[PDB]
From a paper:
Although the structure of Tt121836-123 identifies it as recognizably part of the pilin family, it exhibits a different fold topology from Tt122238-123. The first β-strand is formed from the loop between the α-helix and what would be β1 in Tt122238-123. Formation of this strand may be assisted by a disulphide bond which links the loop to β2 in Tt121836-123 (which is β1 in Tt122238-123). This location is similar to the conserved disulphide observed in TTHA1221 and Tt122238-123, hinting that this may be a common structural feature of Thermus pilins. The structure also contains a second disulphide bond, which links β2 and β3 in the equivalent location to the D loop. Both Tt121836-123 and Tt122238-123 form 4-stranded β-sheets, but the location of the strands is displaced between the two: a short α-helix and β1 in Tt121836-123 are formed in place of the loop between the α-helix and β1 in Tt122238-123; β2 in Tt121836-123 aligns with β1 in Tt122238-123, and there is no equivalent of β4 from Tt122238-123 in Tt121836-123. Our results show that TTHA1218 and TTHA1219 are closer in structure to T2SS pseudopilins than to other type IV pilins for which structures are currently available. In P. aeruginosa, the type IV core minor pilins, FimU, PilV, PilW and PilX, are clustered in an operon; determination of the crystal structure of FimU revealed close similarity to the T2SS pseudopilin GspH, despite the low sequence homology between the two proteins. Inspection of the structure suggested that its formation is plausible but would require two structural changes to alleviate minor steric clashes.
T4P are composed of both major and minor pilin components, although major pilins comprise the majority of the pilin subunits within each fibre. We identified a cluster of type IV pilin-like genes within the T. thermophilus HB8 genome, using the program PilFind.
Residue numbers in the entry: 44 to 125
The structure:
Amino acid sequence: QTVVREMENFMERLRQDPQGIPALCNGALALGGKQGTCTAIPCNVAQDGGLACPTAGDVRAFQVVLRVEEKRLETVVYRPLE
């Protein structure tokens, strides 16, 4: 499936650009010829690595949900310590 492959490529593109995610993953877009959407939820990361999405405080990672028709792909992109 072309759509699944494109969703993975785009997701990898986001994973390389965590500081760009608020702009690059911000509503509707086309992938593999179909309309879909990207949503990025800011998450906290505990000292033990536990994830809180959405965050009540610091944004240390994003929960990214890419949706194209019924297909869906969710991952976590961690932000650099800086």
